[PDB]
Amino acid sequence: GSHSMRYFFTSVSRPGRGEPRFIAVGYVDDTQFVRFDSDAASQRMEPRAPWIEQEGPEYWDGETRKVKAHSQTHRVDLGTLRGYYNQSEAGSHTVQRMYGCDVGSDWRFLRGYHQYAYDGKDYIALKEDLRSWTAADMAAQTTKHKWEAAHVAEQLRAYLEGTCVEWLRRYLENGKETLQRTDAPKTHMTHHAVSDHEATLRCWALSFYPAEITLTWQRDGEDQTQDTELVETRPAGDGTFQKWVAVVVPSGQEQRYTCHVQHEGLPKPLTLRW
């Protein structure tokens, strides 16, 4: 089993008046555990999972200092990139950053990563080997040399293979009641007559965790994609997820069709009939 800790930053310039809006959220796998929001009163990194409140005042003081620093780096960035891209001061613009680390089944560092976007487009990302950068354009080529020169990668590497993974292990342990618990989907099937000749079969997966899931219809033991609808996975809003898939079939023929569920919470795939 691999697990991930990830951090997602967003800054939207507010030209006309003020500093940019800065929202920062942290996740372990599919669980959010911290947030910061420049519009909030506290001006503090805030807890969003029960198991992180375990952490002392000095954690919240450490995290807050670091994340206000990050909002300032994004503030400079927005201005630097307005100029790189020869944009006016009139318009609103966005920077987005994501970084994180994974551990493997050995509980050891498995993976690291870091990506940057300007107005919704790649700008610069760290390479998988964590020694070097990938610039999307000639602007980003300026940033790459600056960061090469500053030895940013080596310091980012030290963090992701160290501090990041260490604290990941910490959170997994502290919140194992939920972070290390898999909820298998609660499945069922519904049937609706659209006419006298035809009917809709809808296969539901409710209340599962993680979010990763596979739902497919088979007819007489072969996959069927024709005449189906498959909604995107959606949060229930209690930390679990939902999904469904539907097929349109001739009335009286429902027995040919099986729904097939794949999920980590299940040791063996599930098969459902009418």
Binding site: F8, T10, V12, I23, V25, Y27, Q32, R35, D37, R48, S92, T94, Q96, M98, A117, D119, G120, K121, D122, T190, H192, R202, L206, V231, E232, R234, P235, A236, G237, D238, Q242, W244
Partner: protein
């Protein structure tokens, strides 16, 4: 300046039963930029108790948010999700259907 239209899903946290307290979700996703206006409605009239998740984004950089409120399904009552974005000429209203 990339401009992606929001995907919308309107649904309930738990299997709908008439007369039993539930929650109504609007999951708006795949949009850019982050600026968006989401309302939940009961018989056209806007609902005030509404809360939302903290802004986040997927690998492809497109945003996503969940808007929710406590509610109770009934026989006659209609519930919808109203969404406005810069990519929409007028607000797009999605109706809640309990079998989806």
């Amino acid at each position: 300046m990339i401009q992606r239209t929001p995907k919308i899903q309107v649904y309930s946290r738990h299997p709908a039963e008439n007369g039993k307290s539930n929650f109504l979700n609007c999951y708006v996703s795949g949009f850019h930029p982050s600026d968006i206006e989401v309302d939940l409605l009961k018989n056209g009239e806007r609902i005030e108790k509404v809360e939302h998740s903290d802004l986040s984004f997927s690998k492809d950089w497109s945003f996503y948010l969940l808007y929710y409120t406590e509610f109770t399904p009934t026989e006659k009552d209609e519930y919808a999700c109203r969404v406005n974005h810069v990519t929409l000429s007028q607000p797009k209203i999605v109706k809640w259907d309990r079998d989806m």
